[PDB]
Nucleic acid binder design. Structure first.
Ligand code: GTP
Ligand code: MG
Ligand code: MG
Ligand code: MG
Lengths: 404, 250
DNA sequence: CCCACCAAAAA
RNA sequence: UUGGUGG
C-alpha cells in the first residue's frame, strides 16, 4: 500500500470531483499538477462542481497556511462485491473490486472497475455485434449480486444472452456467485422475522412484510389497494442484501471506533492490560465483555467496542495481548470520520490512516468466519462455509485501491 | 443561551410536524366550519380533515394512493373509497375521470407552507446531543420515539456507542461554498434554496458550530438526520458542511 | 434485489 | 402510491 501526504490527498480529492475517480493515484496527481494554476476556471465543467470548488478553496487555504475543516472523500469501489469476495475467500472476485491488487502486463497496480471488467469480458465472448449498453449491464450485475433474478432477466432476456451472463459471473467470481445463489434457498417459510447479531453486538431484526391487496370499486371502475402486512413467504430474495448491508454497517461502526477514539480511554486500557490500573470493577460489564469476546473467538472480528466493558475483573476473561495488538494497529492520532455507508470523509492528513483501517477490516473479514457465524443464525442451525482461498486475507492487508 | 436557542429550535420543530400542523389549517384556522359541514354530509370528522390534509399535500392523487393514507379510519378498504366519493360529490375536492385522479381545491396558505418547508424536518443541534442510554430518544431534548428508523423497534443492543460517537462531531457551515451555489450554480428550485439560508442562519445564530444526530436502520447502516443540512444526501448539500475543528494540514 | 429520505398538479 | 435524493 503506497502512502500520500496530506496535501496530496487534497489533490486526489479535487481530481476525483472533476472527476477522474477511476484513474490511478499517480495519474490523478499528474492531472492535478498540470492544472493547479487554473483550478477556479474548471469548476463549470467538473462532474461535482460544488465539491470540486470546496476542495479547491481548501487547497488554496492550505497553500497560505490557513487551517481547514474540509474533509476529503475516499469511496469503497463496489462495497458489496468487496464484502462478498472477503466472506467467501474469492480471489477472482477480489481482483474485480480492489480487495487485492491487480497488475497489468507492465506490472502497475490498476484501479479496477468491476462492472467494466465484466462488461468487457461479456463483449469479448459474445462477439459479433453484442447489443448491450454498459450501464444496463451494471444494473444487472449489481441487482444480481443482491439476489435479483428479474432485473438481469430484463437486461439480457432469458436465452443465450442470459446464459452467457451467468457463465461470465461464474468464472469472474465463482464463490461470490455460488453464495448469492445459496442465499435464495435460505428463507424459512414459517418465519415472521429473521434475527442475527453482528460481532460488535448489533442486533439485526428483519420483519417479513408481504403484500395484502384489497380491491375497490369507485364509479364502477376497478382499483387495487395494496398495503404491506406482516406475514411469511415461500422463497425470500432479501437475505443477501440484508446480510451484506449489515456487514458494511459493521465496517462503518468499527472503522469509526478505531479512528475517532478517546485518547484517555486508550491509555487506561493499555495500563489495564499491563496490570498497572487502579482497581475498578462493575458486574454489569461482565455480560457484555463475555459476549463480545465470544464473537471474537467465533469470527476473528475483535471490536474496539470491547474497551467500554474492560475493567480489573473483566480483563481476566480476555487475552490481553490481542487487546494490545488491536490498539497498536490503530492510528497514532485520532480523527473524525463522516460516512455515507461506504463513502468515507476525513481531514486529508488522515488519508493514510483511513485506508489502513479499511484494509484491516476487509482483511479481518477475509481471514475469519463471519459468514458462517451469520448464516447459522439466519437459517437456524450450525453451518460452516469455507474459504475458497484461505490466504486471500494476506493480500488484502496490502491492497491499493479498496477505497479510491 | 445556546441551550435556550436549542429549546427554541425544538419548539419550532414540534409545532411543525407535517400532519398535525396541516390539520390546524382545516380546524382552528379555517373560515369554513368543517365540523358542521362534515356532520351535514355524514362523514366522520377526523376522516374528513385527514382527507382534506392529504389533498393539500399531494395536490393530485390517484385512488390507491389516497386510500392508503386513510385506511386506518375504517374496517374496510371499500368504506374509505365510498367516503371519498361522498366528499368529492360535495365539492370537498374534485375527481376527474379522464385522468383517474383527485385534484385539490382547498390548500393551505403560503405563509403556513413556508414554515412547514423550514421546520418540519429535524435540524442540527447547537449544543452537544444527549448521550443515548436506551433505544428511545434520538439526541434531542424533547423527542422520545424509537431511535431505529421506521417501525422496527427493539430493546436489544443496537450499538448506541456509535450514535453517541457520531453525534458529538462538531460541524459548521462553509459560508463561502454556500454563497457560491446561489450566486454561480445557474451558470454552472429557487424557492427551495431560499429556505436553506434562512434555516442555516437561524441555526448558527449563536455561533457557527452544531451537531447532526444519527439513527440506524434495522440492518445497522447509520443515517445522519436532517434535510437542509446533511453530509449525506445531495451533492449541493455535502459541499457546504465541514468540520468545526479546523487543522493546519502541513 | 435492499435500504433510507424528499416532493407534490393545470383554464 | 406516481416521481426524485443518497448508498
Ligand atoms: N441493493 C442495492 N444496492 C445498491 C443499489 N445501488 C447502489 N447500491 C449500493 O451501493 C454499493 C455500490 O455502490 P454504487 O451505487 O454501485 O456506486 P459505484 O460503484 O461507486 O458507481 P457510481 O454510481 O459511478 O458511483 C452496493 O454494494 C450497494 O450496497 C441498488 O440499486 N440496489
Ligand atoms: Mg460516487
Ligand atoms: Mg420509487
Ligand atoms: Mg438510486
Amino acid at each position: 500500500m503506497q502512502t500520500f501526504t496530506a496535501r496530496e490527498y487534497l489533490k486526489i480529492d479535487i481530481a476525483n470531483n472533476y472527476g477522474l475517480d477511476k484513474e490511478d493515484w499517480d495519474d490523478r496527481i499528474a492531472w492535478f499538477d498540470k492544472n493547479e494554476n487554473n483550478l477556479l476556471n474548471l469548476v463549470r465543467e467538473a462532474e461535482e462542481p460544488a465539491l470540486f470548488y470546496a476542495g479547491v478553496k481548501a487547497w488554496m487555504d492550505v497553500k497560505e497556511g490557513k487551517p481547514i475543516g474540509y474533509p476529503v472523500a475516499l469511496d469503497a469501489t463496489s462495497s458489496g462485491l468487496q464484502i462478498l469476495a472477503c466472506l467467501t475467500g474469492d480471489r477472482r472476485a477480489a481482483e474485480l473490486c480492489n480487495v487485492v491488487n491487480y497488475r497489468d502486463e507492465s506490472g502497475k497496480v490498476k484501479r479496477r472497475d468491476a462492472y467494466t471488467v465484466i462488461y468487457n469480458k461479456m463483449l469479448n465472448t459474445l462477439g459479433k455485434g453484442a447489443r448491450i449498453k454498459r450501464n444496463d449491464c451494471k444494473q444487472a450485475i449489481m441487482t444480481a449480486l443482491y439476489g435479483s433474478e428479474a432485473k438481469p432477466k430484463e437486461v439480457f432476456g432469458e436465452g443465450i444472452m442470459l446464459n452467457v451472463f451467468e457463465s461470465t459471473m461464474n468464472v469472474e467470481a465463482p464463490a461470490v456467485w455460488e453464495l448469492n445463489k445459496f442465499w435464495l434457498q435460505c428463507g424459512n417459510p414459517e418465519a415472521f422475522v429473521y434475527h442475527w447479531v453482528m460481532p460488535d453486538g448489533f442486533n439485526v431484526y428483519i420483519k417479513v412484510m408481504v403484500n395484502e391487496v384489497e380491491t375497490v370499486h369507485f364509479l364502477d371502475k376497478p382499483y387495487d389497494c395494496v398495503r404491506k402486512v406482516q406475514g411469511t413467504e415461500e422463497k425470500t430474495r432479501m437475505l443477501s442484501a440484508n446480510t451484506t448491508h449489515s456487514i458494511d454497517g459493521l465496517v462503518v461502526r468499527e472503522l469509526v471506533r478505531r479512528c475517532d477514539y478517546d485518547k484517555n480511554q486508550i491509555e487506561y486500557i493499555k495500563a489495564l492490560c499491563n496490570g498497572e490500573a487502579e482497581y475498578k470493577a462493575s458486574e454489569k460489564n461482565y455480560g457484555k465483555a463475555m459476549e463480545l469476546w465470544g464473537y471474537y473467538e467465533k469470527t476473528g472480528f475483535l471490536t474496539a467496542r470491547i474497551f467500554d466493558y474492560l475493567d480489573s475483573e473483566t480483563i481476566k476473561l480476555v487475552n490481553t495481548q490481542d487487546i494490545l495488538d488491536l490498539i497498536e494497529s490503530m492510528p497514532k492520532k485520532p480523527f473524525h470520520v463522516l460516512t455515507v455507508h461506504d463513502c468515507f470523509r476525513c481531514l486529508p492528513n488522515y488519508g493514510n490512516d483511513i485506508r489502513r483501517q479499511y484494509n484491516n477490516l476487509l482483511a479481518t473479514i477475509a481471514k475469519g468466519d463471519l459468514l458462517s457465524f451469520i448464516m447459522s443464525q439466519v437459517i437456524g442451525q450450525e453451518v460452516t462455509i469455507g474459504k475458497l482461498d484461505p490466504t486471500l486475507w494476506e493480500d488484502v492487508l496490502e491492497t491499493e485501491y479498496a477505497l479510491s | 443561551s445556546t441551550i435556550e436557542h436549542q429549546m427554541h429550535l425544538e419548539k419550532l420543530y414540534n409545532k411543525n410536524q407535517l400532519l398535525p400542523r396541516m390539520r390546524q389549517e382545516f380546524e382552528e384556522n379555517s373560515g369554513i366550519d368543517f365540523k358542521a359541514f362534515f356532520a351535514h354530509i355524514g362523514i366522520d370528522y377526523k376522516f374528513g380533515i385527514d382527507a382534506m390534509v392529504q389533498m393539500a399535500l399531494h395536490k393530485r392523487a390517484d385512488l390507491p394512493t389516497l386510500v392508503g393514507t386513510l385506511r386506518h379510519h375504517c374496517k374496510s378498504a371499500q368504506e374509505v373509497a365510498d367516503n371519498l366519493f361522498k366528499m368529492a360529490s360535495e365539492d370537498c375536492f374534485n375527481f376527474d375521470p379522464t385522468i383517474d385522479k383527485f385534484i385539490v381545491i382547498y390548500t393551505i396558505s403560503d405563509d403556513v407552507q413556508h414554515e412547514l418547508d423550514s421546520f418540519q424536518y429535524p435540524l442540527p443541534m447547537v449544543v452537544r446531543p444527549k448521550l443515548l442510554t436506551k433505544n428511545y430518544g434520538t439526541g434531542y431534548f424533547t423527542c422520545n420515539k424509537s431511535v431505529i428508523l421506521k417501525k422496527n423497534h427493539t430493546d436489544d443492543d443496537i450499538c448506541l456507542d456509535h450514535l453517541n460517537r457520531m453525534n458529538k462531531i462538531p460541524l459548521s457551515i462553509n459560508w463561502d461554498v454556500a454563497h457560491m451555489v446561489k450566486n454561480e450554480w445557474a451558470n454552472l428550485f429557487q424557492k427551495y434554496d431560499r429556505t436553506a439560508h434562512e434555516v442555516m442562519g437561524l441555526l448558527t445564530q449563536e455561533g457557527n458550530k452544531f451537531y447532526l444526530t444519527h439513527r440506524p436502520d434495522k440492518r445497522g447502516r447509520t443515517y445522519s438526520q436532517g434535510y437542509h443540512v446533511n453530509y449525506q444526501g445531495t451533492s449541493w448539500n455535502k459541499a457546504v458542511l465541514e468540520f468545526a475543528e479546523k487543522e493546519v494540514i502541513d
